[PDB]
């Protein structure tokens, strides 16, 4: 038996939705089929070189042309449900950018620090 | 059953019939499958036949436990 979910193995949806390599966050509770073990390298390399062939007749992962990069997949956020298009079970995985509040010094600051005109096409600008 | 649902529970904490989808164009609208839409087609067809006055032939009225 494997550690990654059986829907990751073979997508629960009829069209094989949610199949392939899904990288997970370290602090996330969900697990993925991306393992760098010497025994798990053959299947994870076949998923990149050849892909998975479904019963319906469509190649899900690596349809062709360009091989994906499994290491740069955004972290897994949930599991696919048949009712909706997607079911989110982990909200902390999705990063939420937030802006700091303004302050008397904040609206006075600038990107660069102050140390103590017609555009001309040039082949090289030193600084 | 006459609407067309097959699984009574979408989750262990809520029924499947009381699932109205948010975050979309239609908020509060109950979710319908293709089977639900086709069963509603059959129901509306039977209703329109009955309103016309001819024999209302509800295709699922002859549906028993063994089919």
């Amino acid at each position: 038996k494997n550690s990654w979910p059986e829907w990751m193995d073979n997508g629960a949806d009829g069209t094989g939705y949610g199949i392939g390599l899904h990288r997970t966050h370290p602090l996330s509770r969900l697990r993925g089929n991306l393992k760098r073990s010497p025994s798990h390298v053959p299947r994870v390399l076949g998923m990149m070189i050849q892909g998975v062939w479904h019963k319906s007749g469509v190649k899900l992962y690596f349809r062709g042309g360009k091989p994906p990069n499994p290491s740069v997949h955004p972290y897994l956020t949930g599991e696919p449900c048949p009712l909706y298009g997607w079911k989110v079970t982990d909200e902390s995985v999705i990063r939420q950018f937030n802006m700091p509040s303004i302050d008397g010094t904040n609206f006075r600051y600038k990107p660069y620090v102050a140390l103590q005109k017609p555009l001309a096409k040039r082949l090289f600008f030193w600084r | 059953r006459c609407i067309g649902i097959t699984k009574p529970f979408y989750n262990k904490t809520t029924l499947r019939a009381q699932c109205w989808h948010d975050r979309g164009l239609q908020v509060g609208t109950l979710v319908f499958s293709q089977a639900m839409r086709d069963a509603l087609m059959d129901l509306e067809r039977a209703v329109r036949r009955k309103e016309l006055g001819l024999e209302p032939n509800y295709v699922w009225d002859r549906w028993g436990p063994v089919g």
Binding site: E6, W7 | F9
Partner: peptide, 24 residues
Amino acid sequence: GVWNDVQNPHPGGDDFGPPRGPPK
């Protein structure tokens, strides 16, 4: 064999998504 031979509804596994059948 020369003669002709002449299907999983829930491939999610044993229990995934909607519960199947009555409990216990």
